[PDB]
Every structure is written in C-alpha cells, then in structure tokens.
Amino acid sequence: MPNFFIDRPIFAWVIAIIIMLAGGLAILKLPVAQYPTIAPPAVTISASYPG
Amino acid sequence: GLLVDDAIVVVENVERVMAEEGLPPKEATRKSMGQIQGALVGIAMVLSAV
Amino acid sequence: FGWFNRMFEKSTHHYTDSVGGILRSTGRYLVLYLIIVVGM
Amino acid sequence: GVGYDWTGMSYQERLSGNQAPSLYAISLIVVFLCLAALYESWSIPFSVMLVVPLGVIGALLAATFRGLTNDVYFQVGLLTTIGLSAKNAILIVEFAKDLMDKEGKGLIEATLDAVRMRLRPILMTSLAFILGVMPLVISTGAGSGAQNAVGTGVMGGMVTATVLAIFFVPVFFVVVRRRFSRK
C-alpha cells in the first residue's frame, strides 16, 4: 500500500525518474521495423536435372 | 572488502551499543537493526548503480 | 590492558578535535579538496 | 582500381557498443537519485558523492609510482574503492542526519558524534582490506603480474581514501545543506 511516499515524496519521485531513465535509453538500442518475426519459416530444396 | 564491511557494520554498531548499557546482547543488536538495516539496503542500491 | 587496549581509540578524541578546527576562523577550506580534484 | 579494408583487430576498433564517460554519466545520475531517494532530499546527495575523488587520487598514484597502467584490473579495484568510500560516507551522513532529525541537534552537534561514531569501524574495514590485499601487491611469480595490477592500486587507492574521507566527508556535509537550503 502507498501512504508511505506521501511522507517521502522524493523517494517516490526517484522511482518515477529511474523507470524513465531506464527505458528511453532502451529507445536508443531497441531494434526497429514494421513487423516482428511473423510468418512461419520455410526451407527450400533446389535440384537440377538438366535437359 | 564489500562483503566483510557489511558484517563489520553489523558488529561495530552493535558493540558501541554496550556503551548504552553495561551487559545486554539481544536488544543491543536489535536496536542496531531497524536503525541501521534501512540504510544497509540503500547501499546495495547505490553500489549496483556503480 | 591499560597501555595496549585503551592505547588504540586514544586517537579518536584528538581526531574529534580536528573537526573543532574545521572552517572555524573564516570561510576558506573547500579549496584544499578542490586541489585534490585537479589533483587527478 | 586499388582499394583496401580493415580486418582483425582493426575491425573491432570501429565498433564496441557505447564508450565510457557516457556510461559513467548514467551512473552519476543514478547514484544521485538513489541518495536523494534515501535522504529524502536533492541536497544531502552532494555530501556523499563529493567523496568519489578521495580514493582515485591514491589509485592514480602507485599506478603512477609502480609501472602499472589503466588496465581492466586497475578499474575494478578502482570501482571497489569509489564504491566503498561512498558507502561508509553514506554512514556518517546517515548518523549525522538522524542523530539530528530524530535526535535534535544540528550545525556541528549533528556532524558531531557521526564522524566520531564512524571511525572505529572504517579503520577496521580499510585495514581488514589492505592487510589481505597485501600479498597480491607484491606477488610471488606464477601469474603474478595480474595480481600486482589488482593490488598496487586498491591498497594505494585505499589508504588515500581512508584518512581522506575521515576528515573531508564531514565538511561536504556541512556547507552542502548549510549552502543548499537557500542562501
């Protein structure tokens, strides 16, 4: 339960800074793109019997 | 160092508290803790970040 | 003991007193630390 | 038609993640907020952080007196001190504030028994360490050189920060909340 932190608004403000500092740094190392790995993977065998 | 120091601080600060009495062991340590334990955790919080 | 045990912390009060000589006369002592910063 | 490229070690130069005084600024910030968190203030943090240097000043000596370099080994035993000196400094400023916040003193009567209370301990730690990091400092021969590098920088960065916080960490505490409470 809260109530703690009301007597301690610095310790509470501190959490809210770290959580914000953590991610954000994350935003500058997290891979970007449209979709993640979505489609089932496939393997293809290629043969050739000329003629 | 880091490991020993942690015990040194939960013995020194529980020895000097035989200079708030003359004999007692059990409450001596217990009055060290509560009024030391809260900061022994805040260290590991700071040292991690180091 | 009286010359071996007490011998030890007998430098604590002399030490305690070295804090009775901190920034007491005028405002100038945070200059010695700042030499140690430029000291690295 | 003639070109070039970098290989081996010269490939691993132009990549390595993200430097150091950048990942040490994020340590600075993060150490601060932690102390602020503990001490309940923006002001009292600057009391324990202003320690940091007291240990590295001795490390950058001995590491300059013996041949030694700025190794990995140097830094590890340089973060071990830059951390340990801050620790027992969090323990003078702790006593000081509480032996005052929950006691009722101040000006000097705060910093009073604090720096007095935290002494018999410190002098234990720093001598618990040194003697014991001692052997590492001049090592026999077998794989020695790496022991020497841990050693002649922790010990030499320990005695420098043992009798340096012991007098200086009381001072920061004073004209830090004396100065940081609005002037």
Curated annotation (Swiss-Prot), chain B:
Induction: Positively regulated by MarA, Rob and SoxS transcriptional regulators (at protein level). Signal peptide: none annotated. Coiled coil: none annotated. Residues 12-36 are cytoplasmic. Disruption phenotype: Loss of susceptibility to contact-dependent growth inhibition (CDI); inhibiting cells still contact the target. Homotrimer, with large domains that extend into the periplasm, interacts with AcrA and TolC. AcrA may be required to stably link this protein and TolC. Interacts with AcrZ. Part of the AcrA-AcrB-AcrZ-TolC efflux pump. This is Multidrug efflux pump subunit AcrB. Belongs to the resistance-nodulation-cell division (RND) (TC 2.A.6) family. The chain crosses the membrane at residues 37-50. It is found in: Cell inner membrane. It comes from the Bacteria. The chain holds residues 403 to 452 of 1049 of the full protein. It comes from Escherichia coli (strain K12). AcrA-AcrB-AcrZ-TolC is a drug efflux protein complex with broad substrate specificity that uses the proton motive force to export substrates.
